[PDB]
Amino acid sequence: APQQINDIVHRTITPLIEQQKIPGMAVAVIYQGKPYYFTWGYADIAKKQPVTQQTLFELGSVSKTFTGVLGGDAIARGEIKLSDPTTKYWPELTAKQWNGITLLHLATYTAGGLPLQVPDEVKSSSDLLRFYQNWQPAWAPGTQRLYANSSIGLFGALAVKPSGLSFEQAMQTRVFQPLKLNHTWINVPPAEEKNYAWGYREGKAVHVSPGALDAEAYGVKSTIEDMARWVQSNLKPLDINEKTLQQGIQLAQSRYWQTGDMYQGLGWEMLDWPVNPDSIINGSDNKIALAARPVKAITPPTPAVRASWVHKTGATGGFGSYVAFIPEKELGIVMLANKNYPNPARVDAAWQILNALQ
Numbered sequence: 001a002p003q004q005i006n007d008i009v010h011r012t013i014t015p016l017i018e019q020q021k022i023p024g025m026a027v028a029v030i031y032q033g034k035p036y037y038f039t040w041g042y043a044d045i046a047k048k049q050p051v052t053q054q055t056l057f058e059l060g061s062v063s064k065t066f067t068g069v070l071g072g073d074a075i076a077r078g079e080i081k082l083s084d085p086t087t088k089y090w091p092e093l094t095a096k097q098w099n100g101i102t103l104l105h106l107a108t109y110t111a112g113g114l115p116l117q118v119p120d121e122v123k124s125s126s127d128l129l130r131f132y133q134n135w136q137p138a139w140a141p142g143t144q145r146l147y148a149n150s151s152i153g154l155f156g157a158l159a160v161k162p163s164g165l166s167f168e169q170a171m172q173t174r175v176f177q178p179l180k181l182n183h184t185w186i187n188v189p190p191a192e193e194k195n196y197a198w199g200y201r202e203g204k205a206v207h208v209s210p211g212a213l214d215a216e217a218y219g220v221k222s223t224i225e226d227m228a229r230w231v232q233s234n235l236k237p238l239d240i241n242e243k244t245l246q247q248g249i250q251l252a253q254s255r256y257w258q259t260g261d262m263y264q265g266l267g268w269e270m271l272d273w274p275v276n277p278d279s280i281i282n283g284s285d286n287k288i289a290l291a292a293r294p295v296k297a298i299t300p301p302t303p304a305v306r307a308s309w310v311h312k313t314g315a316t317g318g319f320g321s322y323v324a325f326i327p328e329k330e331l332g333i334v335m336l337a338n339k340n341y342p343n344p345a346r347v348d349a350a351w352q353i354l355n356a357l358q
């Protein structure tokens with residue numbers, strides 16, 4: 001890699017690892033469209049297995065970017081419309097509060113207060129229906145954004161219904177395979193489990209536990225190479241030969257709602273570039289990122305703006321991830337770690353690197 005990249009990566013990430021006690025980390029810096037890879041530490045401490053470019057990490061909520069693009073691909077196929085009512089795809093959702101809640105609201109967390117989590121007691125389709133049937137909204141739809149796995153999670157599940165495919169089969173055939181993400185998995189196959197890093201929480205080795213709608217909201221695992229290719233695909237959608245997927249990527253970066261200097265896409269979140277770094281750093285703290293905030297509709301949604309900081313944080317019990325990119329500059333970064341360390345530390349490091357390379 002260019003010396004300038006090597007230097008800023010060492011001086012930014014090695015101290016981050018020292019400061020945050022991260023056991024293993026993989027970073028990809030995309031510079032002029034090309035990924036440069038860096039690894040540190042161990043995927044499995046006790047076995048002394050190093051992190052490599054083939055190590056699988058839990059992406060956590062970075063998974064929502066795949067769900068948003070899959071939903072965009074379904075829009076481009078004409079299979080769904082964001083204005084469609086939820087009940088078109090789930091008629092059994094007869095409760096009156098669902099009158100007026102659209103797929104747009106589900107995808108963008110604006111349904112009116114769907115909770116952050118699907119309750120752990122939900123273990124079957126019948127349990128899931130009772131959960132949504134009994135939910136009482138705190139706000140009218142389309143007025144407040146409250147980040148929630150139960151919101152975009154339902155969006156993903158319903159968006160694939162017209163295809164007749166399971167969510168996992170839809171994601172594999174319509175996103176992973178066309179983009180040659182051949183080491184990205186909702187369910188890690190046994191033959192690949194040897195590359196699956198352990199996450200570390202308070203010293204103990206942990207993996208994410210199953211949960212309702214986990215694949216849609218936080219359940220994808222991937223390598224640093226595949227995630228760099230994901231960033232390249234979102235930086236340069238016109239390079240993708242499948243037209244519905246090219247357009248789905250663009251639709252996921254459209255701006256549907258604004259709150260402060262942040263715009264809500266499908267999975268992705270966006271800000272105008274140049275960005276105020278303190279805003280993205282401070283705003284990534286869960287105290288803010290998970291709080292309810294009023295939104296203003298953008299009608300029609302702004303088509304994907306090239307001069308944007310586009311990003312998503314993600315976490316599981318034992319992992320912490322971050323992806324950010326700037327289409328106008330063909331600049332991006334992926335940071336995968338097997339410790340869940342505070343989001344602001346992730347964003348600060350990413351901005352220090354990309355700012356140095358602009």
Ligand SMILES: *C(=O)/C=C/N[C@@H](C(=O)O)[C@](C)(Cn1cc[n+](C)n1)S(=O)O
Pocket residue numbers: 059060061062117208209210211214217218313314315316317
């Ligand atoms: C996106 O990053 C969301 C991640 N969810 C985390 C979290 O809430 O901190 C997990 C995945 C929570 N969770 C709920 C149900 N299950 C199986 N995990 S993590 O702490 O376990």
Ligand SMILES: [Cl-]
Pocket residue numbers: 010011
């Ligand atoms: Cl140094």
Ligand SMILES: [Zn+2]
Pocket residue numbers: 010011014
């Ligand atoms: Zn040094």
Ligand SMILES: [Zn+2]
Pocket residue numbers: 180181182183184223225226
């Ligand atoms: Zn791969």
Ligand SMILES: [Zn+2]
Pocket residue numbers: 183
């Ligand atoms: Zn392989």
